[PDB]
Design an enzyme around this catalytic site. Structure first.
Site, PDB file in Angstrom:
ATOM      1  N   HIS A   1       8.328   8.257  -4.109  1.00 20.07           N
ATOM      2  CA  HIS A   1       8.922   7.101  -3.445  1.00 20.07           C
ATOM      3  C   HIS A   1       9.831   6.267  -4.330  1.00 20.07           C
ATOM      4  O   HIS A   1      10.594   5.471  -3.805  1.00 20.07           O
ATOM      5  CB  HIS A   1       7.841   6.145  -2.878  1.00 20.07           C
TER       6      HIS A   1
ATOM      7  N   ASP B   1       3.723  16.350   0.852  1.00 20.95           N
ATOM      8  CA  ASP B   1       2.882  15.151   0.921  1.00 20.95           C
ATOM      9  C   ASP B   1       2.767  14.695   2.380  1.00 20.95           C
ATOM     10  O   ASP B   1       3.694  14.942   3.167  1.00 20.95           O
ATOM     11  CB  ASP B   1       3.567  14.080   0.070  1.00 20.95           C
TER      12      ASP B   1
HETATM   13  C1  LIG Z   1      -2.365  -5.656   7.202  1.00 20.86           C
HETATM   14  N1  LIG Z   1      -1.970  -5.417   5.808  1.00 20.86           N
HETATM   15  C2  LIG Z   1      -2.116  -6.564   4.911  1.00 20.86           C
HETATM   16  C3  LIG Z   1      -1.525  -4.103   5.356  1.00 20.86           C
HETATM   17  C4  LIG Z   1      -1.391  -2.982   6.318  1.00 20.86           C
HETATM   18  C5  LIG Z   1      -0.945  -1.694   5.900  1.00 20.86           C
HETATM   19  C6  LIG Z   1      -0.648  -1.411   4.509  1.00 20.86           C
HETATM   20  C7  LIG Z   1      -0.197   0.002   4.087  1.00 20.86           C
HETATM   21  O1  LIG Z   1       0.424   0.498   4.691  1.00 20.86           O
HETATM   22  N2  LIG Z   1      -0.666   0.530   2.919  1.00 20.86           N
HETATM   23  C8  LIG Z   1      -0.395   1.844   2.281  1.00 20.86           C
HETATM   24  C9  LIG Z   1       0.949   2.520   2.622  1.00 20.86           C
HETATM   25  C10 LIG Z   1       1.585   3.155   1.370  1.00 20.86           C
HETATM   26  C11 LIG Z   1       0.894   4.414   0.888  1.00 20.86           C
HETATM   27  C12 LIG Z   1       1.886   5.558   0.702  1.00 20.86           C
HETATM   28  C13 LIG Z   1       1.744   6.108  -0.711  1.00 20.86           C
HETATM   29  C14 LIG Z   1       1.506   7.622  -0.779  1.00 20.86           C
HETATM   30  O2  LIG Z   1       0.407   8.099  -0.491  1.00 20.86           O
HETATM   31  N3  LIG Z   1       2.486   8.433  -1.141  1.00 20.86           N
HETATM   32  O3  LIG Z   1       2.266   9.648  -1.177  1.00 20.86           O
HETATM   33  C15 LIG Z   1      -0.791  -2.492   3.546  1.00 20.86           C
HETATM   34  C16 LIG Z   1      -1.222  -3.815   3.959  1.00 20.86           C
HETATM   35 FE   LIG Z   2       1.323  10.412   0.292  1.00 16.85          FE
HETATM   36  K   LIG Z   3       6.295  15.046   2.691  1.00 12.86           K
END
Ligand SMILES: CN(C)c1ccc(C(=O)NCCCCCCC(=O)NO)cc1
Ligand SMILES: [Fe+2]
Ligand SMILES: [K+]
Ligand SMILES: [K+]
Length: 357
Positions: free
Chosen positions: A122, A157
């Site tokens: 990312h 991924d």
């Molecule tokens: C209500 N609130 C405070 C939230 C709601 C959702 C998230 C979130 O999306 N979190 C994780 C998304 C990113 C993970 C992607 C990274 C990854 O696994 N890459 O491979 C955060 C805070």
């Molecule tokens: Fe991921």
């Molecule tokens: K992917």
């Protein structure tokens, strides 16, 4: 010649510190060792990336900000990428590790090089994003470009590999292919099938948007169908493969319903091209499942069949209550309508008709 395995104790200790995946790196290596696969690879010590090496992609302003807050403990260092102490060193280690693996492939040391602790797809040139503080996949691709004319980057991924796609969105020298969950509100929000790159890079980005609960059979059907077309149109000279294990049933991302077997079939397909292949990890938040996955995939790379029973070793306790390598799919519904998957494949097949070398 034998696959290169990027490893040292200091490197693992370093990767272990990542607050989101504590001790994951040791778990993966420890299971790999328990099955004795490391005896069958060439272990190479990763080098730490220098400031100018990371500057091949990242801006000098971003890097210096990273270095600064890394003492203190606009560059995207918020909720997903907090500014903890030592983060610059952790980032340099992982970037160096991916670059070392690239260098092994360039020198013909091997046809396959493994950095399971890389795959941070990312990060942008001037911004951290989604737990990724440095884009090691981009650094590795840029290194391979010294030797190999066309690079294929394949991203399996759960999440869209937006950092890598964006890095190369305007070029025809690197084709990016990402299969990923694509749904409203789901990070990072890009990668619909109609995203194909821009300018001279138009059609040199492929995106396969997928819904919750995809399983091994339909997944491999998608992956094979896309990769066969890519290989014919694009004719890559080297491959960078990102295998984040957050697709695997049991993951707290709670999205896809895959097992390492389905993933490994994708990996075999690529390996039969017999190109320079740089293998990377990525996401993977059920820590024992991630070690089960990447251990299995390491088996696949070496064409060994591994025993069902997890050997006793350090993290043996983490593999209960059943103590087996196989992962069972969950009972979650498969939300992928076969008619929808067909339009997606055809759409991509269309797009790739524009690619002629
Ligand atoms: C209500 N609130 C405070 C939230 C709601 C959702 C998230 C979130 O999306 N979190 C994780 C998304 C990113 C993970 C992607 C990274 C990854 O696994 N890459 O491979 C955060 C805070
Ligand atoms: Fe991921
Ligand atoms: K992917
Ligand atoms: K591209």
């Amino acid at each position: 010649l034998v696959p290169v395995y990027i490893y040292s104790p200091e490197y693992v200790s370093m990767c272990d510190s990542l607050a989101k995946i504590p001790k994951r790196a040791s778990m993966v290596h420890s299971l790999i060792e328990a099955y004795a696969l490391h005896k069958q690879m060439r272990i190479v010590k990763p080098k730490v990336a220098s400031m100018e090496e990371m500057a091949t992609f990242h801006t000098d302003a971003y890097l210096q900000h990273l270095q600064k807050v890394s003492q203190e403990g606009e560059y995207g260092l918020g909720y997903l990428c907090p500014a903890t102490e030592g983060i610059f060193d952790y980032a340099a280690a992982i970037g160096g590790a991916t670059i070392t693996a690239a260098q092994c492939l360039i020198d013909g040391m091997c046809k396959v090089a493994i950095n399971w602790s890389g795959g941070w797809h990312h990060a942008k040139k001037d911004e951290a994003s989604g737990f990724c503080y440095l884009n090691d996949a981009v650094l590795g691709i840029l290194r391979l470009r010294r030797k190999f004319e066309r690079i294929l980057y394949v991203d399996l991924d759960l999440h869209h590999g937006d950092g890598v796609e964006d890095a190369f969105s305007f070029t025809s020298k690197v084709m990016t292919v990402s299969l990923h969950k694509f749904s409203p509100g789901f990070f990072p929000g890009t990668g619909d099938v109609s995203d194909v790159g821009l300018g001279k890079g138009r059609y040199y980005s492929v995106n396969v948007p997928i819904q919750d609960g995809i399983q091994d059979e339909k997944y491999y059907q998608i992956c094979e169908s896309v990769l066969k077309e890519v290989y014919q149109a694009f004719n890559p000279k080297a491959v960078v493969l990102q295998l984040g294990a957050d697709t695997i049933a049991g993951d707290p991302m709670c999205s896809f319903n895959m097992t390492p077997v389905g993933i490994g079939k994708c990996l075999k397909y690529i390996l039969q091209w017999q190109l320079a292949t740089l293998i990377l990890g990525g996401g993977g938040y059920n820590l024992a499942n991630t070690a089960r996955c990447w251990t299995y995939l390491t088996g696949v790379i070496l064409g060994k069949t591994l025993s069902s029973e997890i050997p006793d070793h350090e993290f043996f306790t983490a593999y209960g209550p059943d103590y087996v390598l196989e992962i069972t799919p969950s009972c979650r519904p498969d939300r992928n309508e076969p008619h929808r998957i067909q339009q997606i494949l055809n759409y991509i097949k269309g797009n790739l008709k524009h690619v002629v070398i």
